[PDB]
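Ligand-bound model needed. zinc ion.
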Amino acid sequence: YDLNAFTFDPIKESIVSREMTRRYMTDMITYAETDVVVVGAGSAGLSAAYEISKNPNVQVAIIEQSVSPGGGAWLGGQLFSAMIVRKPAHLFLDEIGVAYDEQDTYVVVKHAALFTSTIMSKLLARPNVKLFNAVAAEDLIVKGNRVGGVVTNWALVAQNHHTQSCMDPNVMEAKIVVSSCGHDGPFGATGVKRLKSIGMIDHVPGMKALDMNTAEDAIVRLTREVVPGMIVTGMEVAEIDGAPRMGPTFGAMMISGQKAGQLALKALGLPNAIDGTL
Amino acid sequence: YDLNAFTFDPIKESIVSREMTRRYMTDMITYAETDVVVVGAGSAGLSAAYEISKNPNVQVAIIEQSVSPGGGAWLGGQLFSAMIVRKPAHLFLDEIGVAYDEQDTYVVVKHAALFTSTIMSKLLARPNVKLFNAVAAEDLIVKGNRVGGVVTNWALVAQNHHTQSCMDPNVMEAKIVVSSCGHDGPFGATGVKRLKSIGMIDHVPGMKALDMNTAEDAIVRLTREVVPGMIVTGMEVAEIDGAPRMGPTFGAMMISGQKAGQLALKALGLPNAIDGTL
Amino acid sequence: YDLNAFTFDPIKESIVSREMTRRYMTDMITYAETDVVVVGAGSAGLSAAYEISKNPNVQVAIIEQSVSPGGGAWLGGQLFSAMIVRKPAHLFLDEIGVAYDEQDTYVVVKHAALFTSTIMSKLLARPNVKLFNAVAAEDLIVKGNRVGGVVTNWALVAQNHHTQSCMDPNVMEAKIVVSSCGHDGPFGATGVKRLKSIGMIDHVPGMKALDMNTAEDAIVRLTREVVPGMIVTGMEVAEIDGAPRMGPTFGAMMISGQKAGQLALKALGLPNAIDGTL
Amino acid sequence: YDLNAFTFDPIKESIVSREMTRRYMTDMITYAETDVVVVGAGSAGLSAAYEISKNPNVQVAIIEQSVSPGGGAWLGGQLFSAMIVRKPAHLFLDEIGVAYDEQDTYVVVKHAALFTSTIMSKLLARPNVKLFNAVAAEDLIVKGNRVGGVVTNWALVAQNHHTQSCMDPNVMEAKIVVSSCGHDGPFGATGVKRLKSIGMIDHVPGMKALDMNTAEDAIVRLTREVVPGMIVTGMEVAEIDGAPRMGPTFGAMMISGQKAGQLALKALGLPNAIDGTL
Amino acid sequence: YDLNAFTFDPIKESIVSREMTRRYMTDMITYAETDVVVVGAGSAGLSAAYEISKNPNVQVAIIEQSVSPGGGAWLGGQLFSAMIVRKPAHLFLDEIGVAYDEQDTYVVVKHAALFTSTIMSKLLARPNVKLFNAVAAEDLIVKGNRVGGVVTNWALVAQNHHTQSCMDPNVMEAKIVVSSCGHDGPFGATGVKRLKSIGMIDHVPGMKALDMNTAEDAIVRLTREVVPGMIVTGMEVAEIDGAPRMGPTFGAMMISGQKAGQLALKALGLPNAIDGTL
Amino acid sequence: YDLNAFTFDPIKESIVSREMTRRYMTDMITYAETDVVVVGAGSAGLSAAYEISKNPNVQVAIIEQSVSPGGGAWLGGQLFSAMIVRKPAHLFLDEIGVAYDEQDTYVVVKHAALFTSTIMSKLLARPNVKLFNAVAAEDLIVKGNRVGGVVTNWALVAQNHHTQSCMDPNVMEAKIVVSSCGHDGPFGATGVKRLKSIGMIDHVPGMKALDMNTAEDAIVRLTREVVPGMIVTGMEVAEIDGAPRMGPTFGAMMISGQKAGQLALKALGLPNAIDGTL
Amino acid sequence: YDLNAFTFDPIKESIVSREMTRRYMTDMITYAETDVVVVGAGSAGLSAAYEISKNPNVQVAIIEQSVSPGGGAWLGGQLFSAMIVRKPAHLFLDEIGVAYDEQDTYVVVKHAALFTSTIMSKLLARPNVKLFNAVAAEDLIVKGNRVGGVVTNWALVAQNHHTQSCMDPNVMEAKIVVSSCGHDGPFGATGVKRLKSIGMIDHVPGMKALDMNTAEDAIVRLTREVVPGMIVTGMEVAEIDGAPRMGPTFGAMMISGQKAGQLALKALGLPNAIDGTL
Ligand SMILES: [Zn+2]
Ligand SMILES: [Zn+2]
Ligand SMILES: [Zn+2]
Ligand SMILES: [Zn+2]
Ligand SMILES: [Zn+2]
Ligand SMILES: [Zn+2]
Ligand SMILES: [Zn+2]
Ligand SMILES: [Zn+2]
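Prediction:
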């Protein structure tokens, strides 16, 4: 084509609508009963989805309330750019294909956005992954003390129940829920806060003050299937357990998310790194 | 008449004013002491008022804070249209004259708005029914151990005590109050929250996580005269009892409401389906 | 069934989701290219859709930004209930089946909500009609000198472009658009304001001060195909033409809407009352 | 009675409701066609109503959007208390029975609230005066280039058309409207701003900068029947005419309002000070 | 003077400023140590101030956060006008000179504003009373478990500590504080809520549901010196004690306030009705 | 004193109140008619007040709407600290006693806050200077063709005319007004916007795009008595004249202010640097 | 230079940017591990930083969330100017060079702004002091049982986690943190509220009611290293200890701050007035 004399092939508006609709319809029908739902597309949730979907047989829905995925991983600290990842999580960066400046006990990715865009590109390309962005998980499906999926709505509806006539949610059944809701914002820690309000867990003390050396090891260690059918990963772990926060460093999110992914595979009865069967 | 050359008969502005004033103020005088007040015109409250007002002896005031009645029954889930009603509540739809597409354990009304408009149209035509919309129930009338009506105001006043000099409420005495306030919004669960703040009940746990099979049977079961003079119906039942929620399905709202209406007839000493005397 | 011992047939959450999704997305595909789109489900828009859809050949989509349809027709004036309809528009009420208390030059419907629910119930039951509520028309489709449909989005999105990353709209092609957006609210007069901002008309003076005798005859008279492909009806007519307003009387809305429907049938080449071929 | 052992006579809640309702109903029926409506109960509007209602045969409705009447006359300047009134308007204070500290060219009432409460008490006691507080004039009634009354609503509705489904206004016919809307607030200058938007006057330049000596004489001089059926008085005069403001002094408001009252009597064909017939 | 040819005597702007300033200064100096401060100028606070200041030797400061005094006594219920006062409180109306329509167990003042304006006019005329409107009591002065006055600020500052750099309060010492803060609004029940937060009282259950017959007698009975140096009166009594509310009736406010006034006189060691020494 | 065993001398709350009241109200009386009022205590206004008040004959009131004085001079750009001052304005820094790091065509003050605090400390110590902070100039006093002072109120009142009953302003007469209101914020360019709305100047184009080399020389040049009685200085000059802006450099503000001060001395008939008589 | 013909030396925009960037980022690197961080630049925090930085060996970072430093020390009470300082804290004023009007048990600084500007000017000139304004301390660094610095962000970010994708904080390590966050505003008492939410202290009762004689001595007394690594000073002490407040008097803030500074020097192992080694 010539950028100086450019013509698009013709279109009809109604075709564009119908293509989008049909495709979103079929996705919602498929994923109404899914193997894994990941709630939250921050560094931890992306890392978990990336790890799980390496198994091509596993269906992965990602529910993200924001229009943009990525969570807090578009920046470092104080609106600066550099992303510090402590060793040995730089091996995870190697696998995804993200360059870094190597230091002695850590590496520096030149922009957090480079990690986030790269992992998302590789993740979203896979046929077994679907991103439902601009959609919130408002609640859980819980039957006989097992989490069995999530209660969904458009994110803007979920934040506007006070300004309109009622707007019921939808429902997505899942074998395993990976809750990766962070701590930040009006949606922070949605999943663990709901476990508490329905009496399935007893306390959500909230994250403690900052201590990077304690926090990152603790967050990985504490990542687990918290109740039957629900794994918690990322900063949401610190909320439920009262672990210290780590601030502007990203290794624990990546590793927590990877561990959560392997826990989800285990929960599905599939080869996994938790068992040593992978 | 001719749509091409159309003339309305003459009017005067004063006539319009006086018509609306004389009629509304007459209705307020009529209903200031009444048989039943239904608080909330959602699916459960409309169903309750519909059921009660089948008896002509019985005067029924419906108090609805929104300008529009209907509550959460203008939509299905995720801003979609279809209204799922589990059997055998399709027999209630048959009685009201709402068509549906039948499936094995449920039916589908093509638009929630078709239910709501249809039942409202039949209900409002009745001479013993009065809709006071744009009016909130701010509080209860309680004398000794018994609910004896509601404390009312324009909904916008009830929402703007923070912005103007004080604006006292009005009062409506009733033999029975049917509280159908839902759980959603700033007015969610007004009646049961008030029973708790005045010490007449102990807790309002809030609805639990979603489980349609448990929730709908539970809401019907738990629909009751909670304290002397006050029946609670619809999702407000889940709030008081800590029942699971059901999300985008509507049978329990209709049946809970119908049961609440029958309980109100029984409380008034009238033939009813609770006793088997209807 | 027994209200004392009540059991719903079994369900699964996934069934409810898939039912609502399959049906809504099927409707969107059906109506993405359609015969008539009515924007606004107030008294004028409901009247127009009611009139058009008397012809079964004609597919009619109603776009309503609010969750609740009905517009300003849930109340009379000053939050009072009575709906004044000047003669001879009481003949339209007769046709729809809405009772009234007759006076000399007008009739009184006991509650505006009785009109609105009744006409909606009859309208929505029809197979050729689809209500897309909680959906705003953000813009028009205009090709050359002609309106060819509407640009749509969830209403909450259309109201929240200031708070999230961009969220493109959808598109619905139509042979005729009937714009019935009122004057009230942030969406008041959307269609005529847009004709002005794209240069297809010159001014939108806004409604003038109140004069019922002038206003209602004027609104009917001025109801028209304003530009090729687009009819304007109801109070949106006053905005474009600088007509006086009428306040709490509703005959002109019903008759303007009826005339707009007949004008749409005429524009589609069908038997109609404008020509005298119905 | 004994303040140490006090018992009220018994009451029924429904009686209180019915008394308020019946009385407000009859007032609204009476005043739906009134001789004078005064819009705004600030110092100018109170002064105008006080002057007019000295004729016991003249019906006076006062429409005030705030719950509290009094407008800007509860304080002096900068939240201080003293009310400066230039001579010879202290003669007006003498008539109403408001004490002052007399200085050479002006007097000082010790609290603006003393003037406001005193004039209101004397005004409201009269049988031909009715105060409709918490009610806004949203618009005018205009028929054939004469103002014929006002379009009313509850004030909170008039400020909330953007948050609810539409809420039509009511209407009050009047022989003469006295617009006394001030300049301050979101309702400031309602009446003259509407004259401009409907093309009945051509410009509303807004008040000029402060100059007490020019402003107070000018405001009195310019008080007039601005268009047929509508007198403007008080600070709203400065808005329409572009007169200077006067800030924390009150004589012109009192005298403007008195003049407006005498102009209203003249407009009604009654003895008055404008003609020298009183 | 001639309303047709009117001239004010000359003024200088700076004189107006200086008069207001000097006068407000001297008032604030005088009242920085006062005999009684009444917090809240609603029906109860006005009634208390009116009762106390019948003793010309007693200094009374009234602190009212709103620009307009009067509290909730500008209206009846539901924005209607009539003020119901149960017998025998109509004797209080007789004393103040407020007309009413006499019924069997109650009387009806035609507009609540007639009571409020009349009592305020008589109250404010007295030399020993000062109204500090647009000023909030933010806190109490408490020394050795006795209330010794109030912590004040301009009301707008008291509501804007979140939008500006810090703005310290002022202080007013008092022999007795009469707290009459109502229950309504963001300032509702200021005085009793502060007693609770500083541990001087133990519970503030809040007002119970409506029951006029119980409430009005209870409110009068419970009006008292709650802690040394502080009397509570009006609806604030119901907040501290958990008494029922009474809604749109005004006798208890008047009588509570009168009793509070006589309690204040007693606390000052002066002749009073509590002792039978008056 | 001993920080380990520290006792303050005794106080009484009333003393503190009376001290603050007597002093402030005395200052208001002093300055109600004054020589110069400076509106705005940003870098330009502080510089102007500093320059003028070098003459002891001259009384200078500074009106600043914010609680904190200093305007935009607490920071450099992008929330960084360093304050760039182009030569030869470093000579003004020398005079005030502000250190800097010298470069070739400019100097760097280490923190903008060091300039602002330093100049304020020297300015405020002077007996002829009074800072009225938390006070806005809402309007001008204009008599005939000449500015003669300012219309003042508490800043929060000036921002809350939409939320309360009216609150009149106060007035300060001045021989000269120096308007230094900046361009930023809701109060940006108050003085020049007012000249335009009262018709004394024709346009306020607003500042143009950034060009430091053009802008700083232009702002100094254009600093002038714009209309009789009123000098405009600082970025408010760019707004009136359509000059380019300079962004994060401060020399023009200091020099414009100094020139404005010299112009004020000249206007007062005093020795000045404009004429060469200083 | 000539104010009549004024030319600035040339500049380039890039130079200004690079100057501000290089300097700020150099300061951030310097202070990322530092001796003392003072959180809050109100009267107590400025006094503490002033006291500490008398020792040149000691690096002191001041973190202030507002753009303007100074806290509540720009005004006295009720937006009045005079700053009351009880003796013997006037000796601290003597040392800083702030003039006052002496009384018997206290002195009066003519404007609070004179104190604040003066102390800031002396403080900020010192080479060992850095003001990071527009920067909030969001959290603490806590390792084991000890506070080791602060978690920082731009203040606007710290206030806008609800409106944007996540924005991680930054970190500053410190040997000692002096928390001087006041009680006022959304950031009031940040440090002590955090000690409570992480479980390091048990309660934050909040300040009690006003009692100047008790409060000021108590605040000095209670100023302490509350937990290892963290001193609390100023009104934040009242919040943690439930001390009474003092309102518009400032001696305790200055003395508490001075004591806090001496406690910080002692904690650093340096000569100090707590020990008597200074
Ligand atoms: Zn109330
Ligand atoms: Zn819901
Ligand atoms: Zn777009
Ligand atoms: Zn309207
Ligand atoms: Zn004003
Ligand atoms: Zn700027
Ligand atoms: Zn975070
Ligand atoms: Zn404070």
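Residues 12-32 of chain E form a domain with the Single alpha-helices involved in coiled-coils or other helix-helix interfaces fold (CATH 6.10.250.160).
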